[PDB]
Structure 1
Amino acid sequence: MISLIAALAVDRVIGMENAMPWNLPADLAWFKRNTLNKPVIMGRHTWESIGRPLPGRKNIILSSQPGTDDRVTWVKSVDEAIAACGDVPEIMVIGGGRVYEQFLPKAQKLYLTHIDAEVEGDTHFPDYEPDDWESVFSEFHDADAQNSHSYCFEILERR
């Protein structure tokens, strides 16, 4: 099973200038809980944005060019990325925009954080047809001293 996980600001913005400009520790904690002990697939730009391997997860990087770091696994196509995960229950696709576009048709589950923040950005999460997806979990949180925007954790499953 393939799942996508992402945090979306207003208008589905996910990034600007290869970075995420906000800081929401509660959302990063949610990201870690939902990805630990699972393979994670990311595109090369997201790998450069994170800047290091994510511990406790098999890190698989999509790139058309040869890899440049043997602490992670490099693959050259979507099918190779999936195969390199092996026989696991859940593969997590962690972006970015181009990678989400390619894996959305193959995904059964979306873990989405909706952040109440207006962000100029240059990367968006794909338009997803709402009729295809059922919301199975949602949890709203107001802003607090650690998290400067309100946010909503949602899990959607393909109908």
Structure 2
Amino acid sequence: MIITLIAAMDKNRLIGRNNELPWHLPADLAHFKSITLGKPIVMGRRTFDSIGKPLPHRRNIVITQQKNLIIEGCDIFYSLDDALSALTKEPEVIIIGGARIFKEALPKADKMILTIINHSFEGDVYFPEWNDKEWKITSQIKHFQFLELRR
């Protein structure tokens, strides 16, 4: 199984603001769609609320501790380990946040597909810091920039 993290962030690793994206970049959202299409996507419960509905054409997997919580069109597991365990037969799994999910996944992640933006936005939640000396930049397309890293 190839564990992959995908996230759009700024120079200070900001990702969210009051349970929302602090920006709107259609180019990044189209990039997110093509990358995630036809694959499992694991997300935190607040990230689902951020989206508002299941992402179409994709197996939406939602992590939560609420044991009676039901969600229409998503599979619910009670830990990241029960998610990865249930997707053992899968070839690739995509983690899309939020911060607590990203943090727990980072040490298990094989690949990273990250969008870095040359701007300083205001916010509250952030992407947890990786170690630049552990990763290798596979692809870097400068338009923001689509940055692919591989451990």
If the length of structure 1 is used for normalisation, what is the TM-score? 0.90
Work out the CA distance in 2 between the residues paired with 1:79 and 1:99: 11
Instruction: Tell me the residue number matched to 1:35.
Output: 36
Instruction: Tell me the residue number matched to 1:155.
Output: 148
Code of the residue aligned with 1:152 in structure 2: it is: Q
Work out the CA distance in 2 between the residues paired with 1:8 and 1:32: 17
Code of the residue aligned with 1:58 in structure 2: it is: R
Which is further off, 36-45 or 77-86?
77-86
Stretches of structure 1 lacking an aligned partner (at least 5 in a row): 142-150
Instruction: Tell me the residue number matched to 1:110.
Output: 112
* Deviation sequence 1:83-108 (CA, Å, 0-9, x none): 33351211000001110000000000
Give the total of aligned pairs: 149
**Which of the residues 77, 80, 86 maps onto 1:78?**
80
SS of 2:112's equivalent in the other structure is strand
Identity of counterpart residues, as a percentage?
44
Contact 2:136 2:149 in 1 (8 A): yes
If the length of structure 2 is used for normalisation, what is the TM-score? 0.95
Instruction: Tell me the residue number matched to 2:13.
Output: 12
**Which of the residues 81, 87, 90 maps onto 2:89?**
87
Contact 2:15 2:22 in 1 (8 A): no
Work out the CA distance in 2 between the residues paired with 1:51 and 1:25: 18
SS of 1:56's equivalent in the other structure is coil
Instruction: Tell me the residue number matched to 1:146.
Output: none
Code of the residue aligned with 2:17 in structure 1: it is: M
Instruction: Tell me the residue number matched to 2:129.
Output: 127
Let me know the Cα RMSD of the aligned residues.
Answer: 1.0
Work out the CA distance in 1 between the residues paired with 2:22 and 2:132: 27
Work out the CA distance in 1 between the residues paired with 2:85 and 2:48: 19
